[PDB]
């Protein structure tokens, strides 16, 4: 009945929107708690309603972080009273609400749940493991994540496989992308051809490494010659200067058939994604997004950290190869787009909404 | 080499005092930092090294106090920089303590791992669990206490069975109460005979119902008269309040043979303990203590937070019956004292300091 959202990111804020969207549809009272741009731009860009309450937490060090935002999220705890306090992901916020949750004695939602780096180096996986433990909610991805936080003795009863929201969030943040006449301004003002690939390019193993920057480089242009198509690449200005670097940025300012582009945003980005023929990246993020969008995906690396994405079909593993490369192209302009989704059918926020109903 | 103990409580540095005491037989360097009387008399009253760091963390919320050692702590653990920080138990000290260390990626130490309630409810169960699972050294006093940090998932190379400290703690102790004519003076000034029984009586299942405390007073007796024995009864407020009330407290007073003393400090009780032919006791802890020190036990209730010890036969549970108290009591004081101790072998302290030299 009533329930508190703590958040402190934007992939938090989007993860969660579905959840945002589906309370707008019940009669639950609920709130958010945003932790710090004092982000309103990206909440109203979603369509989202502002965040009751901003606690700006600044800087400091990590114990005072911690510390600020346990004294902070408790004041609001205590004048809000809520019987769920739901969060998602795993930053300081999610740990500190979660712990004075806790402490309170309100019962805890983690969403997306299970997931496990087995590197319990890093702070985040820690967070993770704890944020799991003090939970009374665990809405777990999948099966595979049920799995570990089942190893982790914790009771099967508070287990709940409901799919990742991150599909939800991104199906319903693209339609709001499309019906944004700025951004629709921005992509129509790039795009030419009803047939683009989108290419993204990042990781360290790829740009600082002269050779298989090098590579990748020619394997675009080998891919552009044969299928005669324009290539959309969004550019940050690391790679850009690993480029101008290797002696390789002219030869693509060159190409008239390849289209650079500065940085963009999420929405604009979602658009770029939904539209393309196949998506060209090394990033995990947007092997998840396009298999989420039925964009054929090529990832140029031999590792991913999405592998779910090449066992439905969504997605082949080329690395550095132009051989791989110019195969993978063939077998994905010819894929009939209709993988089976392994981040979920798309309604988790609803789902995880109406279990929370139920308690 | 460099080496944090984090504390807060009595309890905490009584179980961590043969952590010290190793310490102090080794080149390690190594400090305190205690949290908040200010403890400095306790510390002198068990030959103890006053903490180099006193954080006075004051009162307030449950977040605020966990937020303020966290900054605190932090400010320390900066300072100092060790290798190790060891904690023991599960107070919001020691999971403030863990936590910054886990986030200022320093290994974590905890004494006396892996014992659970499995009653997610009482914060401290929860202290507990993110305290474990923060911890990179897990010295675990029994098997099944592995057994419970395994299931978990917690990986088995950073589980050391290791004993309780409690056992070199109370036995330790017990030889330093002895050395302190302060207290010698007050033991000498109570025990007549040498013979006498130690009873301590406290629960509430057991003060409150004027039933089950007419029927223990009334067994006390007939104890008395059977095997015309002294016994002495340290008697907190709250009894004494329900005996005046039960109209028994008279009859007590009247009983030459029973000797009442106004409530005692650790060594002086601990003094009793050692010295009694027989201690009879609702508390665990004393169940705890009179096994470590071979003094058999009977205890007047009928579940016991301490089982191990009617396992190996130092104790046995006769609750509200006075013939189940007969029984015991013939049984005990025949009884030859040599039974197994479940807590461990008495070398913890220095076993957990090996362990730490080696890492």
Not at 199 to 216: F, G, W
Request: glycine letters at 6%; charged letters at 30%; proline letters at 3%.
């Amino acid at each position: 009945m009533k329930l508190s959202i703590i958040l402190g990111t934007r992939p938090e804020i989007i993860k969660l929107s579905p959840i945002i969207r589906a309370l707008e549809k019940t009669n639950i009272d609920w709130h958010i708690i945003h932790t710090n741009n004092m982000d309103k731009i990206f909440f109203e860009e979603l369509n989202l309603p502002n965040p009751k309450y901003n606690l700006n937490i600044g800087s400091g060090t990590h114990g005072e972080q911690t510390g600020k935002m346990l004294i902070e999220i408790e004041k609001v705890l205590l004048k809000e009273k809520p019987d769920v306090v739901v969060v998602q992901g795993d930053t300081n916020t999610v740990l500190a609400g979660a712990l004075v949750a806790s402490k309170l004695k309100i019962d805890v939602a983690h969403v997306e749940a299970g997931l496990r780096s087995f590197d319990r180096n890093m702070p985040e996986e820690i967070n993770r493991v704890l944020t799991d433990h003090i939970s009374s909610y665990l809405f777990a991805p999948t099966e595979i994540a049920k799995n570990n936080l089942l190893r982790e003795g914790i009771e099967e009863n508070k287990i709940f496989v409901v799919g990742n929201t991150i599909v939800d969030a991104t199906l319903q943040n693209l339609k709001i992308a499309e019906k944004n006449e700025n951004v629709r301004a921005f992509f129509n003002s790039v795009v030419i051809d009803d047939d683009y690939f989108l290419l993204t390019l990042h990781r360290a193993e790829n740009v600082d490494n002269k050779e298989r920057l090098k590579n990748i480089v020619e394997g675009i242009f080998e891919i552009i010659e044969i299928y005669d198509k324009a290539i959309i690449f969004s550019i940050h200005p690391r790679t850009k200067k690993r480029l101008k670097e290797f002696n390789l940025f002219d030869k693509l300012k060159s190409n008239k058939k390849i289209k650079i582009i500065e940085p963009v945003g999420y929405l604009e980005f979602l658009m770029l994604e939904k539209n393309a023929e196949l998506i060209l990246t090394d990033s995990g993020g947007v092997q998840e997004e396009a298999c989420i969008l039925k964009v054929p995906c090529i990832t140029l690396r031999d590792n991913t950290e999405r592998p779910e994405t090449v066992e439905v079909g969504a997605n082949i593993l080329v690395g550095d190869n132009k051989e791989k490369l110019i195969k993978a192209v063939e077998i994905m302009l010819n894929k009939k787009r209709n993988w089976k989704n392994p981040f979920g059918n798309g309604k988790s926020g609803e789902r995880i909404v109406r279990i929370l109903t139920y308690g």
